[PDB]
Amino acid sequence: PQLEARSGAKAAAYTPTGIEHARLLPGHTTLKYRKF
RNA sequence: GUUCGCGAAGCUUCGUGGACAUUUGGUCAAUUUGAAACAAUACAGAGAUGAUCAGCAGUUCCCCUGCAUAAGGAUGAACCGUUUUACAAAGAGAUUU
Numbered sequence: 001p002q003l004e005a006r007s008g009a010k011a012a013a014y015t016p017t018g019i020e021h022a023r024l025l026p027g028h029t030t031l032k033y034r035k036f
Numbered sequence: 037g038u039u040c041g042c043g044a045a046g047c048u049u050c051g052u053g054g055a056c057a058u059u060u061g062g063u064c065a066a067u068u069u070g071a072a073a074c075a076a077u078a079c080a081g082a083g084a085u086g087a088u089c090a091g092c093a094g095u096u097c098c099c100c101u102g103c104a105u106a107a108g109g110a111u112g113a114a115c116c117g118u119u120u121u122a123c124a125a126a127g128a129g130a131u132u133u
């Protein structure tokens with residue numbers, strides 16, 4: 001059948017889409033720091 | 037045109053030097069030939085497995101709907117096929133020098 005297992009994943013870079021994702025929206029702009 | 041000065045005619049009118057203001061818009065030009073899709077007809081037609089059916093993924097130089105990192109698309113699409121060598125060692129028989 002085609003109900004099939006696998007060998008490897010992927011990572012290929014295209015031109016960015018420019019879509020306004022919900023999570024990507026700004027939040028926690030301030031980074032904290034340590035004392036020293 | 038505005039005007040601030042000069043020179044001629046009768047504050048009114050011509051002739052001049054300046055100052056003011058200064059380069060728009062087009063990745064495009066209006067019907068077939070620079071690329072939309074559904075639909076329709078005809079023809080078939082539904083994942084495993086015997087059959088019926090659920091859902092989830094996975095790979096991809098396939099996308100669509102979706103605000104979407106939800107979710108959904110025929111289990112969304114194509115995958116179901118082709119598949120003969122890093123190839124050596126031992127034994128037996130045969131023709132050629």
Ligand SMILES: [Mg+2]
Pocket residue numbers: 111
């Ligand atoms: Mg289904």
